[PDB]
Design a protein around this nucleic acid. Structure first.
Ligand SMILES: CC[C@H](O)[C@@H](C)[C@H]1O[C@@H]1C[C@@](C)(O)/C=C/C=C(\C)[C@H]1OC(=O)C[C@H](O)CC[C@@](C)(O)[C@@H](OC(=O)N2CCN(C3CCCCCC3)CC2)/C=C/[C@@H]1C
Ligand SMILES: [Zn+2]
Ligand SMILES: [Zn+2]
Ligand SMILES: [Zn+2]
Ligand SMILES: [Zn+2]
Lengths: 160, 113, 85, 182, 289, 76, 209, 47
RNA sequence: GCCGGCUAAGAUCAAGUGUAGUAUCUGUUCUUAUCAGUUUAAUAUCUGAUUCCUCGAGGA
């Protein structure tokens, strides 16, 4: 897990030897793994590249971070408001700093991860201090231009 | 509905002294003739007049379609000793698994000797 | 009981009948006859003088090994006459 | 009056070829010695199985037969014969000892399609058009995993870059064969 | 003359038949441009039944005349018709069709027959692939030395047929391997033959008599084409296996390898070290002038 | 019964084995036909006679004498 | 210059590299046949000609895939070498050498035998000469068989099958056949006996005397 | 399928001291255990 | 084959049908158990010995 780098944000043009060919300049990528879905039978955008040394994986994570690969925000990492279609290049501290401009955050946010890879699932949950920050996130942040990924902010629970 | 997959062939015109055995030989020269599953007596029909008179027309159904297309390009416009035959895909206008599998096993490639 | 004789072969030439004329005695092939068949002296004697080596009918022509059997030196065993017990 | 596996492993020069049943042979020392000869592929491995050499799993259901490339590219004259003997290639072949068994069928440069899908323009004549991963290499330094790699702008000059080649590896006789047709 | 001549081919006298076939053969060899190709097709389809004749001269003349007619009208149409006929008929007619395909492929180079025959193996239906395999078997047996240019083309098909669960598939593929091995010998085709041996060998533990017979035939053909050293290398580790089944099979194969080419094996035996009681090293071969 | 006859003829040929063949029989068989092959091939005997500095008749006689009991006497 | 070739008494050939800066001798290739090597000759950077105690000559070449920079699959080395030539001579060869014999001629492989014989193996330069000589050998194998009952193809395949060698000692026996059989042989090659004789003499005078 | 119990090799148990005297079942599983995690763990104990 | 398991993973003993040959189908049973011998690469197989609980009954 230390020598392997988890890549997120892969489109349909990216393939299993294509990621190994793109990561060959960063370091000696020994193997590439792409988990296939059960309903569609294709990649879900997240994969893994197992290299030989941890320094090559660190250089690939520091070089290929927030890159625009196949029209997709590909990024390598070390393997009541709901935000969907978020970029995997952002972290919890980056999401807390991005959410601090609209309103005040009550605590540190959390992002959902896949049970197989564990880098990024695609959705996240963040809680605001009051309902005014949630309304400002649903008015402004729900549709704002993020890092090559159109996010969507919505309410997790609402009572009619 | 079934446009192709028609294993029946229609022999337009034949000598009026045609027997059944000479006809089934003519037809067996081009493949295996399908047999009625409940019985013997290959599925071959000699069309007859209101009497014993022979109209001179014949029907023959085959096991497979390739044998039909074989008879089409080898029997059509070919002369038996006296007469000129005509061959066409038969027109129609108006137990099972056991013997099906047997006739299939007639095409086997099993070890002999 | 289809067994070859496998005795020391002599100067007698093997014969084939009208039904077996083109056949190879060992593998029953019909392609490329190559080597003349020799039989032992007990297979060539008296009433056995001219006889098919495969079946035993009246011989009409020479028996041959095929090129495939000649390449594998299967013509170097004994008398290839089919004998029944 | 028969060896144990660990006892026989102590006697032989090569213990990793010893197996469970090897101690039950009539002459295990000769068996293990022949198992270590510098050749001699081993036994087909399904002698002890109980499934008649054809595994009924692994999803063998697949395409019937994929003809070679030379198959596709009167019916064809001596010119298409010329084509079939110019296109004829040698297929993949396994060497002397690679036996088959039931299971063993399933188990600086960028492509033009990936560069077109990623939104990267083509290489100009005399300018600086780096990939977006090259800015991190120009800021932090060269990668220690591949020190011999050259990039345009940092180590390679701008006029280099030609087509889709955005990098080159520069690693720091009488090679002609002897008897060959002319 | 020829349309008057074609009904005599069905006469049942031997001299009449032989002379008629010879005459039609001469006509097809020299005067081929005087009669339509459809009548030639009918005549060849009629000649198909004479390959079963009880007499050798009839078969010889029929082979000659079929070769001439095939050389005349072209391989494409006759090959299509022969494949259709191989698909739908009884045993003897299918065997005669196989012989006819081999004849067509020998007169008109097998380059013209092999693609259409391999395209028929692509049909997803048994009893069609087995016919293609029998035709390939007889084709290689019939062309012999000419096959040295076509071993690379049929290797993946033989791989597929040897990986198959059907027994007739593997038996016929073994027969093909045997005929191909004995056909090319001294022509430098050892790579593909070793590759195919890697797929033939796992079938030695087969109980079915026909399959094991074909496997033994293929092994004895590879003993000639590939050499006894490779066969001894395949037998060494099983000669002294703990199981009696493995020992029986391997000693049968070894005795077959030993009876043929006993002399070559002298240079191939592996070194066996002396024990306390007995001396096993051959010291003369260790001399160094 | 043709296969059974082949199984009896293969056993008949001297030098063939079976599932009960021991190491000693195998090794003496290959030693014996090695000595016969040396006697047959003219340039192998030349090599040996040059190597050990003997006449070729002497090497032939030595090989014939070694033919009797190669690999020592059998077990038990 | 870079590599070392080792001959084993019973194994054929081992390829070794000397690491000048690491002071290491590493085995990176070997063969798949047992050979009782008597002598060896380097033909180029990848190919070796070998001889045998049993009277055989062979040529072994490294595949183009071969990696030299190494730091077993058959209880041997990881990479293997391919055999591209096999020939039985009938006598034990003790000397092999690549050289040019006549002034202004071509390079040949000269060998020497324990019975006092001297011979050469020369390469073909075109496919037409190779095909013509192959057909000559094929037709002379049948219509002029060896005198003591031996099969010619089986004799040159004594220990290993022949690979890519034409027996020119069988081919030059054409000049000593009777005119009727010389015509029967020549009319199959679409040629006359004098043309075949001239073609046989050309390849000999190109290399040797 | 009590018949598979004795046909596949069960009811015959093997134990390994390198693996906590862990007793394994029929030979197909017992031969595979040396590659599994628990045996690697037990072997690392000795080094 | 499906998401370790759902007893389609094996052997066997009687009968029917049928082929030149291979075969195909039904009832079954499958020791749920131990020891000794034979045997098997190891299984397998074969050869012999081996009072209580519950509501007259059943199970061990
Ligand atoms: C697998 C197929 C079957 O075994 C099948 C042959 C056989 O089971 C049937 C029964 C039966 C009696 O009908 C068989 C028929 C026989 C044949 C079709 C053979 O024809 C003959 O016997 C004719 C005659 O004996 C000799 C003709 C001949 C020399 O061409 C012979 O074939 C050959 O020897 N070849 C094969 C090699 N070929 C090349 C061509 C270049 C120069 C000639 C030699 C090399 C030449 C012709 C016959 C071939 C038929 C298979
Ligand atoms: Zn034969
Ligand atoms: Zn007969
Ligand atoms: Zn006899
Ligand atoms: Zn353990």
């Amino acid at each position: 897990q230390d020598a392997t780098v988890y890549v997120g944000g892969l489109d349909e043009k990216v393939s299993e030897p294509l990621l190994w060919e793109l990561f060959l300049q960063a370091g000696p990528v020994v193997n590439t793994h792409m988990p296939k879905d059960r309903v569609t039978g294709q990649h879900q955008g997240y994969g893994f590249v197992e290299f030989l040394s941890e320094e090559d994986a660190d250089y690939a994570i520091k070089i290929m971070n927030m890159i625009k690969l196949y029209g997709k925000p590909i990024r390598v990492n070390k393997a009541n408001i709901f935000i969907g279609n978020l970029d995997p290049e952002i972290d919890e501290k980056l999401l807390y700093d991005t959410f601090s401009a609209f309103g005040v955050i009550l605590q540190t946010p959390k992002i959902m991860r896949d049970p197989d890879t564990g880098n990024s699932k695609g959705y996240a949950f963040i809680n605001f201090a009051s309902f005014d920050a949630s309304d400002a996130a649903i008015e402004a942040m729900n549709g704002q231009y993020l890092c090559n990924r159109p996010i969507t902010v919505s309410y997790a629970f609402k009572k009619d | 509905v079934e446009e192709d997959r028609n294993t029946n062939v229609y022999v337009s015109g034949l000598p009026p002294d045609i027997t059944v055995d000479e006809f089934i030989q003519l037809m067996s020269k081009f493949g295996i003739i399908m047999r009625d599953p409940q019985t013997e007596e290959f599925k071959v029909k000699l069309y007859k007049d209101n009497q014993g008179n022979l109209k001179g027309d014949g029907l023959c159904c085959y096991l497979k379609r390739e044998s039909v297309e074989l008879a089409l390009k080898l029997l059509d416009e070919d002369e038996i000793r006296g007469y000129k035959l005509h061959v066409e895909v038969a027109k129609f206008q108006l137990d099972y698994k056991k013997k099906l599998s047997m006739q299939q096993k007639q095409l086997d490639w099993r070890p002999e000797r | 009981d289809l067994i070859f004789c496998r005795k020391q072969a002599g100067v007698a030439i093997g014969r084939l009948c009208e039904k077996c004329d083109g056949k190879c005695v060992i593998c029953d092939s019909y392609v490329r006859p190559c080597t003349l068949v020799r039989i032992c002296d007990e297979c060539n004697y008296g009433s056995y003088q001219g006889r098919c080596v495969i079946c035993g009918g009246p011989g009409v022509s020479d028996a041959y090994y095929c090129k495939e059997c000649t390449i594998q030196e299967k013509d170097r065993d004994g008398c290839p006459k089919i004998v029944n017990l | 009056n028969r060896f144990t596996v660990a006892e026989l492993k102590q006697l032989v020069a090569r213990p990793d070829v010893v197996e469970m049943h090897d101690v039950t042979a009539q002459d295990p020392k000769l068996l293990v010695h022949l198992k270590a000869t510098r050749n001699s592929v081993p036994v087909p491995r399904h002698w002890c199985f109980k499934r008649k050499y054809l595994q009924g799993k692994r999803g063998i259901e697949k395409p019937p037969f994929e003809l070679p490339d030379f198959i596709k590219r009167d019916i064809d004259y001596q010119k298409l014969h010329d084509a079939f003997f110019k296109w004829q290639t040698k297929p993949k072949l396994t060497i002397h000892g690679d036996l088959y068994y039931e299971g063993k069928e399933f188990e600086g440069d960028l492509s033009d399609e990936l560069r077109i899908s990623l939104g990267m323009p083509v290489g100009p004549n005399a300018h600086k058009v780096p990939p977006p991963w090259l800015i991190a290499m120009q800021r932090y330094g060269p990668p220690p995993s591949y020190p011999n790699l050259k990039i345009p702008g940092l180590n390679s000059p701008i006029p280099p870059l030609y087509g889709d080649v955005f990098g080159t590896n520069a690693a720091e006789i009488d090679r002609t064969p002897w008897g060959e047709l002319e | 003359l020829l349309p008057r001549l074609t009904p005599i081919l069905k006469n049942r006298h031997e001299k009449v038949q032989e002379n008629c076939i010879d005459l039609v053969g001469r006509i097809a060899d020299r005067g081929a441009e005087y009669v339509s190709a459809r009548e030639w097709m009918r005549i060849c389809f009629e000649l198909l039944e004479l390959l079963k004749a009880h007499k050798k001269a009839i078969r010889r003349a029929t082979v000659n005349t079929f070769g001439y007619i095939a050389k005349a009208i072209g391989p494409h149409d006759v090959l299509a018709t022969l494949l259709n006929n191989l698909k739908v008929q009884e045993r003897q007619n299918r065997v005669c069709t196989t012989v006819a395909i081999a004849i067509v492929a020998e007169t008109c180079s097998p380059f013209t027959v092999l693609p259409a025959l391999m395209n028929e193996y692509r049909v997803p239906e048994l009893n069609v692939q087995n016919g293609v395999l029998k035709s390939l078997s007889f084709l290689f047996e019939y062309i012999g030395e000419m096959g040295k240019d076509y071993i690379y083309a049929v290797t993946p098909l033989l791989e597929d047929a040897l990986m198959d669960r059907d027994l007739v598939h593997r038996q016929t593929a073994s027969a093909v391997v045997q005929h191909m091995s004995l056909g090319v010998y001294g022509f430098g085709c050892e790579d593909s033959l070793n590759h195919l041996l890697n797929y033939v060998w796992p079938n030695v533990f087969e109980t079915s008599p026909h399959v094991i017979q074909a496997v033994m035939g293929a092994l004895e053909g590879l003993r000639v084409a590939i050499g006894p050293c490779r066969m001894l290398q395949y037998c060494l580790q099983g000669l002294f296996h703990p199981a009696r089944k493995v020992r029986d099979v391997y000693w049968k194969i070894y005795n077959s390898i030993y009876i043929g080419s006993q002399d070559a094996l002298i240079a191939h035996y592996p070194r066996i070290y002396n024990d306390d009681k007995n001396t096993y090293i051959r010291y003369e071969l260790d001399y160094i002038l | 019964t043709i296969h059974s006859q082949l199984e009896h003829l293969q056993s008949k040929y001297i030098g063939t084995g079976h599932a009960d063949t021991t190491k000693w029989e195998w090794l003496v068989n290959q030693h014996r036909d090695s000595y016969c092959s040396y006697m047959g091939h003219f340039d192998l005997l030349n090599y040996f006679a040059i190597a050990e500095n003997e006449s070729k008749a002497r090497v032939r006689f030595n090989l014939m004498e070694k033919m009797l009991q190669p690999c020592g006497p059998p077990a038990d | 210059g870079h590599r070392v070739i080792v001959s084993d008494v019973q194994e054929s050939f081992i390829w070794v590299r000397y690491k000048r800066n690491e002071n290491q001798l590493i085995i990176f290739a070997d063969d798949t046949y047992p050979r009782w090597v008597t002598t060896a000759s380097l033909l180029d950077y990848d190919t070796v000609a070998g001889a045998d105690k049993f009277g055989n000559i062979c040529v072994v070449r490294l595949p183009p895939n071969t990696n030299d920079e190494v730091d077993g699959l058959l209880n041997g080395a990881s990479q293997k070498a391919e055999v591209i030539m096999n020939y039985h001579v009938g006598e034990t060869v003790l000397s092999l050498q690549k050289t040019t014999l006549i002034p202004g001629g071509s390079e040949s492989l000269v060998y020497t035998t324990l019975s006092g014989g001297i011979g050469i193996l020369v390469p073909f330069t075109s496919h037409e000469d190779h095909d013509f000589f192959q057909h000559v050998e094929m037709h002379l194998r049948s219509e002029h068989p060896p005198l003591c009952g031996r099969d010619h193809l089986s004799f040159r395949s004594y220990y290993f099958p022949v690979k890519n060698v034409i027996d020119g000692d069988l081919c030059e026996q054409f000049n000593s056949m009777e005119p009727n059989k010389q015509k029967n042989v020549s009319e199959e090659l679409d040629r006359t006996p004098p043309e075949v004789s001239k073609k046989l003499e050309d390849i000999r005078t190109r290399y040797a005397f | 399928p009590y018949w598979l119990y004795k046909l596949h090799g069960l009811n015959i148990n093997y134990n390994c001291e390198i693996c906590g005297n862990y007793t394994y079942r029929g030979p197909k599983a017992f031969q595979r255990h040396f590659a599994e995690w628990r045996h690697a763990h037990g072997m690392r104990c000795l080094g």
